[PDB]
Amino acid sequence: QVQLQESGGGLVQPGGSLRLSCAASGFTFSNYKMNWVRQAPGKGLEWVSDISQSGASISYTGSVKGRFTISRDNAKNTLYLQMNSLKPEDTAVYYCARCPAPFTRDCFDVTSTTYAYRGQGTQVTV
Amino acid sequence: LAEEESYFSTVKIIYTVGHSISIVALFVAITILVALRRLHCPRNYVHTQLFTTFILKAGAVFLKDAALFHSDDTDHCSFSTVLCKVSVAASHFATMTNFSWLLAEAVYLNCLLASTSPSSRRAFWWLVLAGWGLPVLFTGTWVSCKLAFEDIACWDLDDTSPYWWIIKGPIVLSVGVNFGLFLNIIRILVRKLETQSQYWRLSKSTLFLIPLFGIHYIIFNFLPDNAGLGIRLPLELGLGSFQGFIVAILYCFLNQEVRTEISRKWHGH
Amino acid sequence: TASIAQARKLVEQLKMEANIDRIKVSKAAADLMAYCEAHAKEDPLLTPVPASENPFR
Amino acid sequence: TEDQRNEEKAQREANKKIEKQLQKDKQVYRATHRLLLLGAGESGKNTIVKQMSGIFETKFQVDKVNFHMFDVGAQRDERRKWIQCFNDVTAIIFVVASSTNRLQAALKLFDSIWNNKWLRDTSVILFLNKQDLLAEKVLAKIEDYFPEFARYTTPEDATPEPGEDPRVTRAKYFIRDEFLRISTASGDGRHYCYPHFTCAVDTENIRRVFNDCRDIIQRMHLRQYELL
Amino acid sequence: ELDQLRQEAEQLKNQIRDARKACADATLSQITNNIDPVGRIQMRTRRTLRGHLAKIYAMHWGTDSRLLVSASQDGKLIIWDSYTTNKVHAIPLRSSWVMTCAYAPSGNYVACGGLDNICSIYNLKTREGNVRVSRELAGHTGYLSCCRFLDDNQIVTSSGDTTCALWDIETGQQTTTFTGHTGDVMSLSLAPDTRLFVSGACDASAKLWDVREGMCRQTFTGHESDINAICFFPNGNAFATGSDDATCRLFDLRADQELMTYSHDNIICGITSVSFSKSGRLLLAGYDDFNCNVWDALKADRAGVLAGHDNRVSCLGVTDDGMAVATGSWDSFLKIWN
Amino acid sequence: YADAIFTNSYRKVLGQLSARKLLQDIMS
Ligand SMILES: CC(C)CCC[C@@H](C)[C@H]1CC[C@H]2[C@@H]3CC=C4C[C@@H](O)CC[C@]4(C)[C@H]3CC[C@]12C
Ligand SMILES: CCCCCCCCCCCCCCCC(=O)O
Ligand SMILES: CCCCCCCCCCCCCCCC(=O)O
């Protein structure tokens, strides 16, 4: 069974830093592109960052580029997000999402409701 | 005169070699394009008919120089035979079919780009009918105006002001309009490429269109039938003998949409 | 939150399962093999029929 | 025998009637342009429609050419399964409302459609919508997201509308170049993108769709000849 | 009080996993180890059915093992005579986007559906001699993905709205709804007794449903990606699934777990369709790489290959008496192998 | 269309040579 488990919680003062982690289980972690997704209070799910299979291609959304760092450990089946210089608009539940299929370039996994290969989230309060 | 008769013998053997290589390559290409079921485009039909016109040209010139140039048992000053007449008419008809189908290649591509929707296919059937009917019509009216007026010396003389344009006019007009169609295609193609590269693609496409349309005929197309023979005879008979070979290579043996399928059915076993 | 209704349904379903009586895997494997072996001759793809009684030739 | 021969020949005549009708339908099928009108939530594609159930169909003619436009309704937010039904349309019309961060969602969706393995031969006619709405965008919010908009100089190449403030021009060309940065990183030459600036009220949208469909068909014809 | 039930579900699923592991004693590759292989299977294209204009998305054999229906994205259903290659009917549909077709076990009806969220029933007998729509089953909220007749009066449909539904044709109402999935239901398969059916979804899980009660008996995990195809073993005690992660699985029902995986390293494309032979010994599977693979369903070794399609293999069906296989593709051709 | 031109020139030189040979041999 595919399951994703995130870890990392608030609350951190503005300007602080915390490191989110996700333990993957039930699939070949090395074949999939991984994403981070968040849901601000009273808004929809929005895409934060994503990393490719090997770790070469990396992409961030606009308002986190420079502060956040994504990285993966293919041996330990783990995904990390290093959040630095946190602002009060970063308060959101952060989910780790998986690309629906392996060896692919595209992904359709920001579905604001009922996407299957997404974690259950971890709250971050700044 | 021995010097120039030997020179003509040498160019004769060189274009016989060229037409033989063309014949074998074109037979291979037509077999490939007709056997494989997936390759039945309305464009591959035009290519196949062009190939067959090249083969007709080669065969007609082979039988013509086999029926006119024997071992010397002919006075050859007053030489006449019904075989002469039918052979010369056959060579004329085959060459007119070749020119009409180069023009049909050009007209089809222009038709493809000048239309709005993939419609209609009236163009293709109009084309296939005209490209085989106009050569027949003009060669037939030529044979008629020969039987009615002039029956001299195996029907070779060209100095007759009339009755030679019945064949030399359609050919000149076809080459003249084929050059304009070539220019229109290259304009359309350069407006699709919008700098270090994109010149190699344009030049490759131009040098690929050169054999398919027979643009190498535009140089001597308007000349008084002389003073080019030092350079035009090797160009249009020596190098122009390989034209079927070059077209078969460029449009059958290249062109991945056939190489992938022949590799598929070869690697299937 | 009214979103906990689906968690209620999920836990009720997961509790309605686990009531199943499961046989050993060896027995199910043996049953599949026995079925495949009792019907080997009537499979026209595992053992093709002569071209005399093949309706597709 | 008699009954076997009668049954076989009746089967043959029915097959001939069916193949005649199929020949008649093939011409109508080959002479039509099928378009997939796709969009996002904020992006109002109904204004693109008013100028032209699980799916809606809209037939319209341009210069005797037939177009057949389809817009999906009552389909969930997961498109990865049913988007494969649209790999043989002539173009996907992608309506996006330039102004949650809806533009980054549009960019991610365009990336997914571009880099899909079944949609890598389908062209995309991109409509960057609501350029007039950017005129009343005077307060200084396109800087919260996309922080690379500060060090961006408008392309002197392109020419804007006569009498437009430079803010809207720079913003709309920045967003057009975002979409073009996505569509250029491919390096393929097998499917092409057509970015246009549209608004709620226009007249040239149908003519634009027609011209880009012509260009798509011409590039397909030129690739069948290996001139492109 | 949400984490309460989340944690309780965690303990329940861990208990189920422990029970599953306890019931396992020996792998299927240890009991079918001394058995003898099937050798090399070699099939040849016997027929090639031409006439569809667009890509073929689905086909279905009749119970007489002679006629078959086929659905294309041009808006046509064509009923074929497979012995003579003649077309029998050609039904123009109201909506062009069709993703499923079914053939009634009596040969009297045909059903189809797709992106218009409707299942349309087509009377084929129609003594007037005119194939016309006899019913339109509306009520689904997403596209129709699969449909199968139980009788000439009941039909089970899966949908991209994450639900299946049992319909009453002559009345037009859905008499049961099967709600357990969290993704698009992509396929379904009826048991030989038609008291159960199995269905795979885009959540990487398959479920076993009781038709007359209306509940989920069991749930089967083990795949990593979307399940595109699902088929029952000939005796109704196991079923095979095909997924986007390029593997198949065997999933015994009474052992309540997975028995065998049919994978291969240079296969990195998804499975579009699966089917068993009449004896259940071979497992045929259509792939995205334009080919089909014949699998030894007991040894997990590959026995043959059905090459000959030029585009994606979309559908695949073994006939009722086991005498031929039919494959459709996105190249718009149907082929019949033997 | 220089093949007819080649045929004409070659037939003309052949007829010239043939007449030359014929007359010179019948007079010599
Ligand atoms: C000296 C005479 C025999 C030469 C005339 C040859 C003509 C009649 C033959 C030779 C090549 C043949 C063509 C070969 C290819 C095609 C394309 C096909 O889609 C329709 C038939 C068609 C158009 C054939 C028509 C007849 C054809 C044109
Ligand atoms: C030397 C003889 C030359 C004969 C010319 C043969 C090629 C002529 C082709 C003209 C066909 C024009 C068809 C119109 C196409 C259309 O719009 O339907
Ligand atoms: C000597 C004969 C000259 C004939 C030239 C014919 C020119 C026809 C031009 C047709 C235009 C083709 C359509 C181009 C459309 C486009 O590129 O956007």
Residue numbers in the entry:
A (entry chain N): 1 to 126
B (entry chain R): 119 to 312, 320 to 394
C (entry chain G): 6 to 62
D (entry chain A): 9 to 60, 205 to 251, 263 to 303, 307 to 394
E (entry chain B): 3 to 340
F (entry chain P): 1 to 28
Describing publication, verbatim:
Growth hormone-releasing hormone receptor (GHRHR), a prototypical class B GPCR, is expressed by somatotropic cells of the pituitary gland. Activation of GHRHR by GHRH, a 44-amino acid peptide released by the hypothalamus, results in the secretion and production of growth hormone (GH) through cyclic adenosine monophosphate (cAMP)-dependent pathways. Like other class B GPCRs, GHRHR consists of an extracellular domain (ECD) and a seven-transmembrane helix domain (7-TMD). Here, we employed the single-particle cryo-EM approach to determine the near-atomic resolution structure of the human GHRHR bound to GHRH in complex with a heterotrimeric Gs protein.
The structure of GHRH–GHRHR–Gs complex was determined from 307,018 particles to an overall resolution of 2.6 Å. The resulting model contains 28 residues of GHRH (residues 1–28), Gαβγ subunits except the α-helical domain (AHD) of Gαs, and GHRHR residues from 119 to 394. Besides, the ECD region of GHRHR was not resolvable with this limited dataset, perhaps reflecting its highly dynamic and conformationally flexible property when bound to GHRH. Owing to the high-resolution map, we identified one water molecule in the orthosteric binding site, and two water molecules in the G protein engaging pocket. Akin to cryo-EM structure of PTH1R–Gs complex, the TMD of GHRHR is surrounded by annular detergent micelle with a diameter of 10 nm, mimicking the natural phospholipid bilayer. Within the micelle, one bound cholesterol and two lipids are also clearly visible in the cryo-EM map. In the complex structure, GHRH adopts an α-helical configuration when engaged with GHRHR. The N-terminus of GHRH inserts deeply into the TMD core and engages an extensive set of receptor-specific interactions. The hydroxyl group of Tyr1P forms hydrogen bonds with H2103.37b (class B GPCR numbering in superscript)21 and van der Waals interactions with T2133.40b and W2825.36b, whereas the main chain NH of Tyr1P forms hydrogen bond with R3577.38b of TM7 and contacts a water molecule that connects with N3466.57b of TM6-ECL3 hinge, possibly stabilizing the ECL3 in an active state. The most conserved Asp/Glu at position 3 across peptide hormones of the glucagon receptor (GCGR) subfamily, Asp3P in the case of GHRH, forms salt bridges with K1822.67b, which is further strengthened by a polar network composed of Thr7P, Y1331.43b, and D1832.68b. Comparing with other class B GPCR–Gs complexes in which α5 helix of Gαs loosely interacts with the receptor TM7–H8 hinge, we found two water molecules in the GHRH–GHRHR–Gs complex establishing extensive polar interaction network connecting the C-terminus of Gαs to the TM7–H8 hinge of GHRHR, thereby causing considerable conformational changes compared to GLP-1R–Gs and PTH1R–Gs structures.
